[PDB]
Coordinates of C-alpha atoms and ligand atoms in Angstrom, one line a residue:
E1 CA 106.5 -5.5 133.9
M2 CA 105.4 -1.8 134.7
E3 CA 107.6 -0.1 132.0
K4 CA 106.3 -2.5 129.1
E5 CA 102.7 -2.2 130.3
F6 CA 103.1 1.6 130.5
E7 CA 104.0 1.6 126.9
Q8 CA 100.9 -0.5 125.7
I9 CA 98.4 1.3 127.9
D10 CA 99.9 4.4 126.5
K11 CA 100.0 3.2 122.9
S12 CA 96.6 2.2 122.8
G13 CA 95.6 5.2 125.0
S14 CA 93.6 3.1 127.5
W15 CA 94.4 4.8 130.6
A16 CA 90.7 5.6 131.3
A17 CA 89.7 2.0 131.2
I18 CA 92.5 0.6 133.1
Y19 CA 91.8 3.3 135.8
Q20 CA 88.1 2.4 135.9
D21 CA 88.8 -1.2 136.3
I22 CA 90.5 -0.4 139.6
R23 CA 87.6 1.5 140.5
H24 CA 85.4 -1.5 139.8
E25 CA 87.6 -4.0 141.8
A26 CA 88.2 -1.6 144.6
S27 CA 87.3 -2.8 148.2
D28 CA 84.1 -1.5 149.8
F29 CA 83.8 -1.6 153.6
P30 CA 81.5 0.2 156.0
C31 CA 82.1 3.7 157.3
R32 CA 79.4 3.8 160.0
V33 CA 80.9 5.9 162.5
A34 CA 82.1 8.5 159.9
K35 CA 78.3 8.7 159.0
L36 CA 77.0 9.2 162.5
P37 CA 75.0 12.4 162.9
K38 CA 77.4 13.8 165.4
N39 CA 80.2 13.7 163.1
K40 CA 78.5 15.4 160.2
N41 CA 80.5 18.5 160.9
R42 CA 83.8 16.6 161.2
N43 CA 83.8 15.7 157.5
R44 CA 85.0 17.8 154.7
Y45 CA 83.4 15.8 152.1
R46 CA 80.0 14.0 152.4
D47 CA 81.3 11.2 149.9
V48 CA 84.8 10.8 151.3
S49 CA 84.8 8.7 154.7
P50 CA 87.4 6.5 156.4
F51 CA 86.3 2.8 156.8
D52 CA 85.7 1.8 160.4
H53 CA 88.3 -1.0 160.4
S54 CA 91.1 1.4 159.4
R55 CA 90.1 4.7 160.8
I56 CA 92.4 6.5 163.2
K57 CA 90.8 7.0 166.8
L58 CA 91.4 9.9 168.9
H59 CA 92.4 8.9 172.3
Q60 CA 89.4 10.6 173.9
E61 CA 86.3 9.3 175.6
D62 CA 84.1 12.4 174.3
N63 CA 84.2 11.6 170.4
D64 CA 87.0 9.7 169.0
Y65 CA 86.2 10.4 165.3
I66 CA 88.6 12.0 162.8
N67 CA 88.3 11.6 159.0
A68 CA 91.7 9.7 158.8
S69 CA 92.9 6.3 157.7
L70 CA 95.7 4.1 158.6
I71 CA 97.1 2.7 155.5
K72 CA 99.2 -0.2 156.7
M73 CA 101.3 -1.8 153.8
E74 CA 102.3 -5.1 155.4
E75 CA 104.6 -6.2 152.8
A76 CA 106.4 -3.1 152.3
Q77 CA 106.4 -2.5 156.2
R78 CA 105.6 1.1 156.1
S79 CA 102.4 2.7 157.3
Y80 CA 100.9 6.1 156.4
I81 CA 98.0 8.1 157.8
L82 CA 95.9 9.8 155.1
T83 CA 93.5 12.4 156.2
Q84 CA 91.5 15.2 154.8
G85 CA 92.5 18.7 155.2
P86 CA 91.7 19.9 158.8
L87 CA 88.4 21.9 159.0
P88 CA 88.2 25.0 161.3
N89 CA 86.9 22.7 164.1
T90 CA 89.1 19.7 163.6
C91 CA 92.6 21.4 164.0
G92 CA 93.0 20.2 167.6
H93 CA 91.9 16.8 166.6
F94 CA 94.4 16.9 163.7
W95 CA 97.3 17.7 166.1
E96 CA 96.0 15.3 168.7
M97 CA 96.3 12.5 166.0
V98 CA 99.9 13.6 165.2
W99 CA 100.8 13.6 168.8
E100 CA 98.9 10.4 169.8
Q101 CA 100.2 8.6 166.6
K102 CA 103.8 9.8 167.4
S103 CA 104.2 11.1 163.6
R104 CA 107.3 13.1 162.9
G105 CA 106.2 14.4 159.4
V106 CA 103.3 15.8 157.8
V107 CA 103.0 16.1 154.1
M108 CA 100.4 18.6 152.7
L109 CA 99.8 18.3 148.9
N110 CA 97.3 21.2 148.6
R111 CA 97.2 25.0 149.1
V112 CA 94.6 26.5 151.5
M113 CA 92.7 28.1 148.8
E114 CA 92.4 26.4 145.4
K115 CA 90.1 27.5 142.4
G116 CA 88.5 30.0 144.7
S117 CA 87.5 27.8 147.6
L118 CA 88.9 27.0 151.0
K119 CA 90.2 23.4 150.7
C120 CA 92.0 23.3 154.1
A121 CA 92.0 25.4 157.3
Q122 CA 95.0 27.3 158.4
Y123 CA 96.1 24.7 160.9
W124 CA 99.7 25.8 161.5
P125 CA 101.2 29.2 162.6
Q126 CA 102.6 31.4 159.9
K127 CA 104.9 33.5 162.1
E128 CA 107.1 32.5 165.0
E129 CA 105.7 35.2 167.4
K130 CA 102.1 33.9 167.0
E131 CA 102.0 30.4 168.2
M132 CA 98.6 28.5 168.1
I133 CA 97.0 27.1 171.0
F134 CA 94.4 24.3 170.7
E135 CA 92.3 24.4 174.0
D136 CA 90.1 21.5 173.2
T137 CA 92.8 19.1 172.8
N138 CA 95.4 21.0 175.0
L139 CA 98.4 21.5 172.6
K140 CA 100.7 24.3 171.5
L141 CA 102.1 24.7 168.2
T142 CA 105.0 27.1 167.2
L143 CA 106.7 28.0 164.0
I144 CA 110.3 27.6 164.6
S145 CA 111.7 28.0 161.1
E146 CA 110.9 27.4 157.4
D147 CA 112.9 26.9 154.2
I148 CA 110.9 28.0 151.3
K149 CA 111.7 26.9 147.8
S150 CA 110.1 27.7 144.3
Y151 CA 107.2 25.0 144.4
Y152 CA 107.3 23.7 148.1
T153 CA 108.0 24.8 151.7
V154 CA 109.7 23.0 154.6
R155 CA 108.6 24.1 158.0
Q156 CA 110.0 23.2 161.2
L157 CA 107.3 23.2 164.1
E158 CA 107.4 22.6 167.7
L159 CA 104.3 20.7 169.2
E160 CA 103.9 20.7 172.9
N161 CA 101.5 18.7 175.0
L162 CA 100.5 21.2 177.7
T163 CA 99.3 18.5 180.0
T164 CA 102.8 17.1 180.2
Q165 CA 104.8 19.9 178.8
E166 CA 106.6 17.3 176.6
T167 CA 107.9 18.6 173.4
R168 CA 108.4 17.2 169.8
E169 CA 109.7 18.6 166.6
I170 CA 107.3 18.2 163.6
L171 CA 108.5 18.5 159.9
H172 CA 106.0 20.0 157.6
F173 CA 106.5 19.5 153.8
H174 CA 104.1 21.6 151.8
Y175 CA 103.8 21.0 148.1
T176 CA 102.4 24.1 146.8
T177 CA 102.3 23.5 143.1
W178 CA 100.1 20.4 142.7
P179 CA 96.8 21.0 141.0
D180 CA 93.7 19.6 142.6
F181 CA 92.6 16.6 140.3
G182 CA 95.8 17.4 138.6
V183 CA 99.5 16.1 138.5
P184 CA 102.9 17.3 139.5
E185 CA 104.8 19.5 137.0
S186 CA 107.2 16.6 136.1
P187 CA 108.4 13.3 137.8
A188 CA 111.3 15.2 138.7
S189 CA 109.7 17.8 140.9
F190 CA 107.7 15.0 142.4
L191 CA 110.7 12.7 143.1
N192 CA 112.6 15.7 144.4
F193 CA 109.9 16.4 146.9
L194 CA 109.5 12.8 147.9
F195 CA 113.1 12.3 148.7
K196 CA 113.1 15.6 150.6
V197 CA 110.6 13.9 153.0
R198 CA 112.5 10.6 152.8
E199 CA 115.8 12.2 153.8
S200 CA 114.2 14.1 156.7
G201 CA 113.8 10.6 158.3
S202 CA 110.1 11.1 158.8
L203 CA 109.4 7.9 157.1
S204 CA 111.6 6.0 159.5
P205 CA 109.7 3.0 161.2
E206 CA 111.2 4.4 164.3
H207 CA 108.5 6.9 164.2
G208 CA 104.8 6.8 164.0
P209 CA 103.4 6.8 160.4
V210 CA 103.8 10.0 158.6
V211 CA 100.5 12.0 158.1
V212 CA 99.6 12.8 154.5
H213 CA 96.7 15.0 153.6
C214 CA 95.5 17.1 150.7
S215 CA 92.0 18.3 150.7
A216 CA 90.0 15.1 150.6
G217 CA 93.0 13.0 151.5
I218 CA 92.7 10.4 148.6
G219 CA 93.6 11.9 145.1
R220 CA 97.0 13.7 145.4
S221 CA 97.7 11.9 148.9
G222 CA 96.8 8.7 147.2
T223 CA 99.3 9.3 144.3
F224 CA 102.0 10.3 146.8
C225 CA 101.7 7.1 148.8
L226 CA 101.4 4.7 146.0
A227 CA 104.5 6.0 144.4
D228 CA 106.5 5.8 147.8
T229 CA 105.3 2.2 148.6
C230 CA 106.1 1.0 145.1
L231 CA 109.6 2.4 145.3
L232 CA 110.2 0.8 148.8
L233 CA 108.9 -2.5 147.6
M234 CA 111.2 -2.3 144.7
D235 CA 114.0 -1.3 147.0
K236 CA 113.5 -4.2 149.5
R237 CA 113.6 -6.6 146.7
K238 CA 116.1 -4.7 144.5
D239 CA 114.0 -5.8 141.6
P240 CA 111.5 -3.3 139.7
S241 CA 109.9 -6.2 137.8
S242 CA 108.5 -7.8 141.0
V243 CA 106.3 -4.8 141.6
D244 CA 102.7 -4.7 140.4
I245 CA 101.5 -1.0 140.8
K246 CA 97.8 -1.7 140.2
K247 CA 97.8 -4.6 142.7
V248 CA 99.6 -2.4 145.2
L249 CA 97.1 0.6 144.7
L250 CA 94.2 -2.0 145.2
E251 CA 95.8 -3.2 148.4
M252 CA 96.0 0.5 149.6
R253 CA 92.4 0.9 148.7
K254 CA 91.4 -1.7 151.2
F255 CA 92.3 0.8 153.9
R256 CA 90.9 4.0 152.4
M257 CA 88.4 4.8 149.5
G258 CA 89.2 6.5 146.3
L259 CA 93.0 6.6 146.4
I260 CA 93.9 8.3 143.3
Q261 CA 91.2 10.1 141.6
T262 CA 92.0 10.4 137.8
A263 CA 93.5 8.2 135.1
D264 CA 96.3 10.8 134.7
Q265 CA 97.3 10.6 138.3
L266 CA 97.5 6.9 137.9
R267 CA 99.6 7.2 134.7
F268 CA 101.9 9.8 136.6
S269 CA 102.4 7.2 139.3
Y270 CA 103.8 5.0 136.8
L271 CA 106.0 7.8 135.5
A272 CA 107.4 8.6 139.0
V273 CA 107.9 5.0 140.0
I274 CA 109.8 4.0 136.7
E275 CA 112.0 7.3 137.0
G276 CA 112.5 6.7 140.8
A277 CA 113.8 3.1 140.1
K278 CA 116.9 4.5 138.4
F279 CA 118.0 5.7 141.9
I280 CA 116.8 2.6 143.6
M281 CA 119.0 0.3 141.4
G282 CA 122.3 2.2 141.8
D283 CA 122.0 5.3 139.8
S284 CA 122.4 7.9 142.6
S285 CA 123.3 10.4 139.9
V286 CA 119.4 11.0 139.1
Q287 CA 118.8 12.6 142.5
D288 CA 120.7 15.6 141.4
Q289 CA 119.1 15.8 138.0
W290 CA 115.7 15.9 139.7
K291 CA 116.8 18.8 142.1
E292 CA 118.4 20.8 139.0
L293 CA 115.1 20.2 137.0
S294 CA 112.5 20.8 139.8
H295 CA 113.9 24.5 139.7
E296 CA 113.4 24.7 143.6
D297 CA 115.7 27.6 144.0
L298 CA 114.1 30.5 142.2
Ligands
910_301 O1 93.4 15.5 145.4 C1 92.9 15.7 144.5 O2 93.6 15.5 143.4 C2 91.4 16.1 144.3 O3 90.9 16.0 145.7 C3 89.5 16.3 145.8 C4 88.8 17.5 145.9 C5 89.4 18.8 146.2 O4 90.6 19.1 146.1 O5 88.5 19.8 146.1 S1 87.1 17.2 146.1 C6 87.1 15.6 145.9 C7 86.1 14.7 146.0 C8 85.0 15.0 146.8 C9 83.7 14.3 146.9 C10 83.6 13.1 146.0 C11 84.7 12.9 145.0 N1 84.5 11.8 144.2 C12 83.8 10.5 144.4 C13 84.6 9.5 145.1 C14 84.5 9.6 146.6 C15 85.2 8.6 147.2 C16 85.8 7.5 146.5 C17 85.9 7.4 145.0 C18 85.1 8.4 144.3 C19 85.8 13.6 145.1 C20 88.6 15.3 145.7 BR1 89.2 13.5 145.6

């Protein structure tokens, strides 16, 4: 049981060991295409690559590679696509994937610049009058509106397939106060953000899988996804006790390496899930508490 285990791991201050155990048992699979010489400039990080068996394939004959993985959680019945922050040369590829995979939402957990370096390219338009056109993939992206809150921003975008002139609305959830290698301000602000994404309908099985990215697409993105899946599993069985977080994380790690980077991110995952369980089990009252406490209005 997660709540009891959390006390014991936290009483004996052994999160580092518990976290290392997961790294030890983690799946290892080949990443051969990601390592092909022609895809060197398509990877933000030399040591972070998508497994061949779960990588998203761009629907083009030229080169189908993008550093993105399809994390399909069979039991929970929800899929996510975790990817790196798009590079100045992979933005077309990024939106091609969003279009091809029929995704409706994009969750960004990082800022364009962090600790003095550029962790992600500016892949979306910042002003309505200056839309972006990706010539290589033939797509057009236009900022339609945006609701800015204290620690996160929700943008409404219109993506157009120039070849067919087909149009889709894409919701963009940008968490701006999540430190790289760090954890959210509190379980509250995290859950508040998660439910925003949830209420947008972006996680609905009627849509393609939601795209989740940070800089490398495994640390923060990993934390985000583990928490969501654990709450969904718990929700489907309406029994928080039937959820093994570590086992769930190890299952995710079969689809993409390195998910969740620090022992504190793992500890925080517990925090978020245990708190979120309150809502799942009938306490709809907590949702307002998380909003009031995230301080999103400032
Ligand atoms: O989102 C965050 O909190 C942090 O995100 C990040 C980074 C960032 O935001 O700058 S860099 C990075 C990274 C890059 C190369 C190797 C390893 N570590 C070695 C490794 C690679 C693959 C699997 C397990 C360990 C980590 C990770 Br993750």
